[PDB]
Design a binder for this molecule. Sequence first.
Ligand code: UFO
Length: 383
Amino acid sequence: ATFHWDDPLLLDQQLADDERMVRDAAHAYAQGKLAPRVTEAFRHETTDAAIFREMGEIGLLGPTIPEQYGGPGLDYVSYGLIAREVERVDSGYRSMMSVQSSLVMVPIFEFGSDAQKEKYLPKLATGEWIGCFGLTEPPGSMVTRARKVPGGYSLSGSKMWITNSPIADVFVVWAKLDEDGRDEIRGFILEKGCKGLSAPAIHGKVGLRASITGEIVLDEAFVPEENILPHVKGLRGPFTCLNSARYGIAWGALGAAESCWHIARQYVLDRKQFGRPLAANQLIQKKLADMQTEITLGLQGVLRLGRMKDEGTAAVEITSIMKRNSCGKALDIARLARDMLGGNGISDEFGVARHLVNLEVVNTYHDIHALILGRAQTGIQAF
Ligand SMILES: CN1CCN(C)c2cc(CN)ccc21
């Protein structure tokens, strides 16, 4: 009976009560604690490690990790809802969280020994320990290498653009290990302090400036026998992690899109031209209709995918659909909002220009998703 412009399909009514509470709690935290930081943190590339303990203590880290290991044992829909509330403020904040959850806690939980899971998960869940994921190098063609030696492994190689690394306590590092007749990617857990490991910070970034990033440099770093992930070998290792992170990013990007939309709408409401508000312009109306439309549909898409993952009916290709669409439409929206603004950086509306440069990086983390889908439709590979 009543129209809700900000939620046309009443996504709010499609959610379970525990999901709603999880969403409202993430919203209260993001707006209450991340929003006051973000303008200055982005402008100056401020490092604030204290954020992990804030997130971990309300159960924002590793949302799907079971209570046995300190997680809040929430479903995929809750995870997406959290990502969306945090990225509503800033993608850099979302990125801290998605690394901790999908790139660190997930491989340890899924592939780790009982011993690894009890040691690492509870502190990753509270944010007492900060994690990072060492995959990218400066996948099938990585060069970081583990050598078998008395008592474990010796690692040499370099990882680049590693979110959290200069503040990380725990490092999940992927490296080739040839043993028996097979050279295969394996995962190793390293700890801050380990000899032959350093994590210099990278500064002067264009986007994601509110998030600290660095390298992982390994110079014959020794890893105890019980720090190798026993239950995974090859591409499946990192792929399981990225698939999980992509799902969170599919939701997150829509939160940033909604911020640029709301800023755009408020701006045209406040501004007048030719004696009428800008909101009276026909073309402005079309842009606002487009923004509303793509966000509204994108949300139905990620909600449905979440529901499918929770019931185990979701193939991995569906994540490619939603990841590509959320990131691509969020970027279009950020650009459409940007091109509506006539100023140059002083006013509140230039919050849009921050989301924009953030989404420009996120979108580049090749169009491989279109190729995954193309192969799934045709049976023919073009990658
Ligand atoms: C002419 N014009 C219009 C508005 N605008 C943002 C701008 C900004 C600069 C340099 N920041 C120079 C010219 C203009």
